Structure 1
Amino acid sequence: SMSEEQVAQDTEEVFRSYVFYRHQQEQPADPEMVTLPLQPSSTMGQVGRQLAIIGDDINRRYDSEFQTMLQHLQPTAENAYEYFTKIATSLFESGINWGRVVALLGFGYRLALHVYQHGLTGFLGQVTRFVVDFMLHHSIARWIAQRGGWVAALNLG
């Protein structure tokens, strides 16, 4: 009724909406996020849009911290995958919850935006895959399926 692969496909759709609407709120603009094509309005698109709004205030308070640490991290095309996986693993080491799932979407957004601002174009799909595959391989996609799929993320907050 809700396989891990189904959640993975939904995650890509949720994340694209998350990226577009989160960037639209915060707006130098990232044209890759301004022009990111999205599927027709759907429940999955609605989740990503709602998850973007609920972080509007909080994200600004954390900008200075994440942006300073990403500058110190100096993520690149060669090390982005390793760094994402280690950071995401530590985040979920003590358990899975909706806040950490949303935080993972947010880190993917921040990581993709940071590398673009430093010249790494055409990498947004790579970061999307990082997010999707990490969830799939680290039991997060299954966790969402156990909660009924991404529809359970609707109206959080």
Structure 2
Amino acid sequence: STMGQVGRQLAIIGDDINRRYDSEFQTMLQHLQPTAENAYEYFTKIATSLFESGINWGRVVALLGFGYRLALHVYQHGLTGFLGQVTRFVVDFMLHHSIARWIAQ
């Protein structure tokens, strides 16, 4: 349609902005190393400094893009950690279960 070309352009635009700065968010997160606790403190402290020097559309989208990469990094970080936390518990609890079973006899 007359507006359909805009929808196709926004798709191309959106797909180019989607995965362009992936490498440059990668480096900022790997040089902070955050966690579910200290993720909130980090973003609020950066957003103040980023906007203390100026505010516009891109500085806002760059900040929200960082927070989305930060959120993905922090919560993927704990999902695999809880896998390592549950499987560790069953293995440790089991191992002590087999020992407690043979000592009582």
TM range (shorter): 0.5 to 0.7
- The number of residues matched between the two structures is 105
Shift of 1:44: 19
Cα distance, 1:98–1:82 mapped onto 2, change above 3 Å: same
In 1, distance between residues paired with 2:104 and 2:6?
15
* Aligned sequence identity (%): 100
* Number of the residue aligned with 1:43: 2
Measured against aligned partners, the alpha-carbon deviations of 1:58-85 in whole angstroms (never above 9, x if no partner) come to 4433212211221221110221111101
Shift of 1:132: 42
Measured against aligned partners, the alpha-carbon deviations of 1:85-126 in whole angstroms (never above 9, x if no partner) come to 111112111222111222222112111111122125999999
Cα distance, 1:103–1:50 mapped onto 2, change above 3 Å: farther
In 2, distance between residues paired with 1:82 and 1:76?
10
Cα distance, 1:114–1:123 mapped onto 2, change above 3 Å: farther
Larger radius of gyration: 2
Cα distance, 1:98–1:114 mapped onto 2, change above 3 Å: same
Q: Which has the higher helix share?
A: 2
Cα distance, 1:82–1:119 mapped onto 2, change above 3 Å: same
Cα distance, 1:60–1:47 mapped onto 2, change above 3 Å: same
* Number of the residue aligned with 2:26: 67
Shift of 1:43: 20
Shift of 1:48: 14
TM-score normalized with structure 2 length: 0.55
Equivalent position SS for 1:61:
coil
Cα distance, 1:67–1:106 mapped onto 2, change above 3 Å: same
In 2, distance between residues paired with 1:48 and 1:57?
14
Query: What is the alpha-carbon root mean square deviation over aligned residues?
Result: 19.2
Shift of 1:131: 38
TM-score normalized with structure 1 length: 0.39
Are the equivalent residues in 2 in contact too, given 1:112–1:127 (CA < 8 A)?
Answer: no
Q: Which has the higher contact order (CA 8 A, sep 6+)?
A: 1
Query: Unaligned stretches of 5+ in structure 1?
Result: 1-41, 147-157
Are the equivalent residues in 2 in contact too, given 1:76–1:115 (CA < 8 A)?
Answer: yes
Are the equivalent residues in 2 in contact too, given 1:108–1:131 (CA < 8 A)?
Answer: no
Shift of 1:142: 66
